[PDB]
Design an enzyme around this catalytic site. Sequence first.
Site, PDB file in Angstrom:
ATOM      1  N   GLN D   2      83.570  87.625  96.986  1.00  0.00           N
ATOM      2  CA  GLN D   2      84.186  87.634  98.329  1.00  0.00           C
ATOM      3  C   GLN D   2      83.572  88.639  99.315  1.00  0.00           C
ATOM      4  O   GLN D   2      83.033  89.666  98.920  1.00  0.00           O
ATOM      5  CB  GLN D   2      85.685  87.905  98.226  1.00  0.00           C
ATOM      6  CG  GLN D   2      86.567  86.738  97.854  1.00  0.00           C
ATOM      7  CD  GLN D   2      87.954  87.182  97.477  1.00  0.00           C
ATOM      8  OE1 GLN D   2      88.800  87.448  98.331  1.00  0.00           O
ATOM      9  NE2 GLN D   2      88.199  87.258  96.184  1.00  0.00           N
ATOM     10  N   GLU D   3      83.679  88.349 100.605  1.00  0.00           N
ATOM     11  CA  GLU D   3      83.146  89.237 101.647  1.00  0.00           C
ATOM     12  C   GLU D   3      81.637  89.479 101.502  1.00  0.00           C
ATOM     13  O   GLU D   3      81.182  90.620 101.342  1.00  0.00           O
ATOM     14  CB  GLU D   3      83.902  90.587 101.717  1.00  0.00           C
ATOM     15  CG  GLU D   3      85.429  90.509 101.900  1.00  0.00           C
ATOM     16  CD  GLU D   3      85.892  90.282 103.351  1.00  0.00           C
ATOM     17  OE1 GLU D   3      85.134  89.675 104.143  1.00  0.00           O
ATOM     18  OE2 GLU D   3      87.030  90.705 103.699  1.00  0.00           O
ATOM     19  N   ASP D   4      80.876  88.394 101.587  1.00  0.00           N
ATOM     20  CA  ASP D   4      79.417  88.447 101.504  1.00  0.00           C
ATOM     21  C   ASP D   4      78.916  89.197 100.270  1.00  0.00           C
ATOM     22  O   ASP D   4      77.975  89.992 100.345  1.00  0.00           O
ATOM     23  CB  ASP D   4      78.808  89.028 102.783  1.00  0.00           C
ATOM     24  CG  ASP D   4      79.006  88.123 103.990  1.00  0.00           C
ATOM     25  OD1 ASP D   4      78.762  86.896 103.880  1.00  0.00           O
ATOM     26  OD2 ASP D   4      79.413  88.655 105.054  1.00  0.00           O
ATOM     27  N   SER D   5      79.569  88.955  99.137  1.00  0.00           N
ATOM     28  CA  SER D   5      78.963  89.283  97.856  1.00  0.00           C
ATOM     29  C   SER D   5      78.746  87.965  97.137  1.00  0.00           C
ATOM     30  O   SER D   5      79.128  86.905  97.659  1.00  0.00           O
ATOM     31  CB  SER D   5      79.807  90.255  97.028  1.00  0.00           C
ATOM     32  OG  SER D   5      80.806  89.592  96.289  1.00  0.00           O
TER      33      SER D   5
END
Lengths: 114, 266, 45, 134, 65
Positions: D2-5
Amino acid sequence: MNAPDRFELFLLGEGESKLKIDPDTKAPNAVVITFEKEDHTLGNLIRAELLNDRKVLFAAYKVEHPFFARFKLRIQTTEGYDPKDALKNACNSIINKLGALKTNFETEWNLQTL
Amino acid sequence: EEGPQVKIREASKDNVDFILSNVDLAMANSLRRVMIAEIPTLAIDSVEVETNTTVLADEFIAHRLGLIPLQSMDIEQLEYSRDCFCEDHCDKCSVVLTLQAFGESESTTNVYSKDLVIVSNLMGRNIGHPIIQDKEGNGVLICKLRKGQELKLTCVAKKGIAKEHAKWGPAAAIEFEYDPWNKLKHTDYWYEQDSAKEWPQSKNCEYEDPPNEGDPFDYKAQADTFYMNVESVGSIPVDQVVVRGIDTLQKKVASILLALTQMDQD
Amino acid sequence: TLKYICAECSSKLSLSRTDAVRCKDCGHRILLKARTKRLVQFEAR
Amino acid sequence: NQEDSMIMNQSSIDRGLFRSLFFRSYMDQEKKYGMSITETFEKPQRTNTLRMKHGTYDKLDDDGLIAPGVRVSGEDVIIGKTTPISSKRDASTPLRSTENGIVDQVLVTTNQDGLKFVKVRVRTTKIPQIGDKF
Amino acid sequence: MIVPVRCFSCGKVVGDKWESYLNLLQEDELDEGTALSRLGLKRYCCRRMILTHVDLIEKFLRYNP
Ligand SMILES: [Zn+2]
Ligand SMILES: [Zn+2]
Ligand SMILES: [Zn+2]
């Protein structure tokens, strides 16, 4: 550089028992076993078979963090039926299906060509 | 026989397309996982390098060496080096092999896994021989040499598990599918106009009965039939990947049983 | 001390200090050291 | 993821997905000053030559340089050099504190002033770890 | 660099497919999709392992040393 070794997924460590059994302090006649160095391969198989035993009130496992090969099994049985026996009959039950599965596969294999 | 039920559809040196009737989902799954990560195998896991004037880097080679599929048929009578009492490795828990290559020709000299030469004492065990399904008999292209180039190194193959590194997989790809008409409604098909015309028909649909709109939802039904296909790399014949898989799974279920008895002591 | 295989050339010059550059028969300086004897191991992972 | 991982297939990684070679070159040179002054490449000894590094020099051959096989790590000295100030002062070059790897090639050559100088180049393979940008 | 010995996706033995691929192309004039199919590279993961691969070694050997 900070990674754990990869054997640490199946090799037990400095005094880590395979099973750990603890009396659940929420509901009566319930227990929560910790399985070190195992995962969904084992847990999902034991839980699903424990759910065929009609004297098992509750049964569910969980990997609290994927970093670690380990999981908790929680088992509640009807009065008088000790949960460990519910685990024991459960494992054995699987082992018997697996054996039958192996032989059944073998005979099928011994009939083929190419 | 009795419970779980197998039915081969196709068989070959490399594949077993079958149908696994009368089993829990959980078990048919747990078997596929074990088949991927837990039937043990032998694979190179140490490379001492004497000379490498090759275009490639030492470890870069060392790496590919690990990936080369070694015969693991009699693997169960080789030992884990970690278990062996000997210091480092031995001829009872590790195969050692040699690689010598030197470019003689003007033309590019290739180095195949055929060029691998067993050296330690196999003592009868069917083990360590590089698998070669290649048609001209040189499976796997280790490296390429120019004229004056040499590569001299020694590899100690060990017993390992794919959990520890994917080299020790006998696995490859395991096909797996149940309920080919979604009769259990285990998915909800994404569509634009028509689920049926847009999603293609699984080959395993000639094997089950299409539902009837005259019928309502069977809610009591469970997942029963399972259409697998195990493909093998070759370090273990196909039939054995499935068998040893069932064997290992069973084996590890067992150590849990035994472990319960170990605790009972006073 | 110790041996230095010519760069653009192939050899095993073992020249030392105060011998300085460059090589033998080659004429060019630039010398690469040669691989050690104390062989190293690699996990094949 | 999540969140650009993102979540990477550890299995496929082992097969060598997104693996890189990593070469670093260290470089040093014999003095640049004096007529009776010349820094020397050698493996110094802590005897009256105090002002040495924490790391071991034990991987230095007699000429003051590693050989293209030796694994190095931590603060291993890689290039040995002493500046003789009136017995000696150390001027040796430690492998980067946070790095570690295997010596790939050692270049000993002269420089346009007739200065002996050296280029050591170390090699690491770097395998995609948790937190690596893609 | 050089033909990966195993496909990353599933890790199928492909390292021994490279030369055979290059022959199917040029020797008997096949097209890469057909060529890839004759090598029994069916599933598209291990398929791209060969098609998308570049043999930089051929260039590396060019250097004398
Ligand atoms: Zn041993
Ligand atoms: Zn020369
Ligand atoms: Zn693949």
